[PDB]
C-alpha cells in the first residue's frame, strides 16, 4: 500500500528528490515482491488505443522528434514500477531516467545534471528503453 502511494506522490513535493533516492525506496531487497501479472489484452487496449500503440511502434524506427511520445511515458513508467509488464531488463541508469520522466515530470536537460551522464548517451539510453518496451507490446498482441 505504501509503495503505490509513493508512485503517485513523486509528482507532488517529492519531485525535488534525486532519482537515485526514489529508486532506493521503491525497491527493497529485504521484502522481495513477486512479479505482477503480464499485461492483458483488455487492460492494454484500455490504456493504449491502437493509434497510441502505432505512434510508439513507428517512432521506434525513426528516433527523430522525441516530442510525439512524451504523453505516453508517464503511463508507461507506472506499469514498469508496478511489477507489471513482465521484465524489461532495464539497467540501473535506464531505470533512473524512466522514473525521472514518467513520475517526477522532469525534462531531459534537468536529469542530465542529476544523472551526470551526457545527454547524447541519455537520449540513446532512453532510445534503448522504449525499444524493449515497444516489442513487448507486440509480443502481447501476437499472443492474442
Amino acid at each position: 500500500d505504501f509503495r503505490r502511494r509513493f508512485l503517485a506522490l513523486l509528482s507532488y513535493q517529492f519531485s525535488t528528490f534525486s532519482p537515485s533516492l526514489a529508486l532506493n525506496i521503491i525497491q527493497n531487497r529485504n521484502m522481495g515482491k513477486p512479479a505482477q501479472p503480464a499485461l492483458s489484452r483488455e487492460e492494454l487496449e484500455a490504456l493504449f488505443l491502437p493509434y497510441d500503440l502505432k505512434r510508439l511502434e513507428m517512432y521506434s524506427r525513426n528516433m527523430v522528434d522525441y516530442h510525439l511520445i512524451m504523453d505516453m511515458i508517464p503511463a508507461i513508467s507506472r506499469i514498469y514500477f508496478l511489477n507489471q509488464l513482465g521484465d524489461l531488463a532495464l539497467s540501473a541508469a535506464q531505470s533512473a531516467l524512466l522514473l525521472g520522466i514518467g513520475l517526477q515530470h522532469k525534462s531531459v536537460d534537468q536529469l542530465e545534471k542529476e544523472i551526470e551522464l551526457p545527454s547524447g548517451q541519455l537520449m540513446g539510453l532512453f532510445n534503448r528503453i522504449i525499444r524493449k518496451v515497444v516489442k513487448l507490446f507486440n509480443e502481447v498482441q501476437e499472443k492474442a
Binding site: 537515485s20 533516492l21 529508486l23 532506493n24 525497491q27 540501473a92
Partner: peptide
C-alpha cells in the same frame, strides 16, 4: 546497482 549509485 542502485545501492552503488547512492554511495
Amino acid at each position: 546497482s542502485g545501492q552503488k549509485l547512492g554511495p
